[PDB]
Amino acid sequence: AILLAEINYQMYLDRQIQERILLTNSIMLLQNLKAAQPTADFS
Amino acid sequence: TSLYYMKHQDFDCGRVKILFFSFCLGRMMGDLFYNYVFRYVYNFFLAIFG
């Protein structure tokens, strides 16, 4: 029983790290998309 | 003196693209050097000469 509680807690930590990964990737993608803003120039 | 007036040409420009930015430097180089530099000097000389 205690071991299963341990497993649950550590899985919670793993998912927190995964959410951190998600934030990092999303910020990077937004930076790229800002670098790739559409241009209104009609030449 | 109008018989030697230099006309304002419209140069077709090659649209270069620096990886997201579209602009044609041919028109810039043409309308700068020929139009706003050389044509300036020639028209200045002719305008004085009149």
Experimental method: cryo-EM
Q: State the smallest CA–CA distance between residue A22 and chain B in angstroms.
A: 27
Beta partners for residue B16, in sequence order: B23
φ, ψ at B5 (rounded to 5°)? -65, 130
Mutate to test the interface with A, among B13, B20, B24, B31 (most CBs of A within 10 A): B20
Amino acid of residue A14: D
Only one residue has tokens 């044509």, namely B39
Beta partners for residue B23, in sequence order: B16
Buried/exposed code over B15-43 (b: 16+ C-beta within 10 A; e: otherwise): eeeeeeeeebeebeebbeeebeeebeeee
Deposited resolution, Å: 3.6
Closest to B22 (Cβ–Cβ): which among A35, A36, A41?
A41
CA distances from B46 to B5, B14, B32, B40 (A): 8, 32, 20, 10
Only one residue has tokens 């620096």, namely B18
φ, ψ at A31 (rounded to 5°)? -60, -45
Rounded-to-integer distance, Cα B4 and Cα B46, Å: 8
Where do runs of H (alpha helix) occur along chain A? 2-35
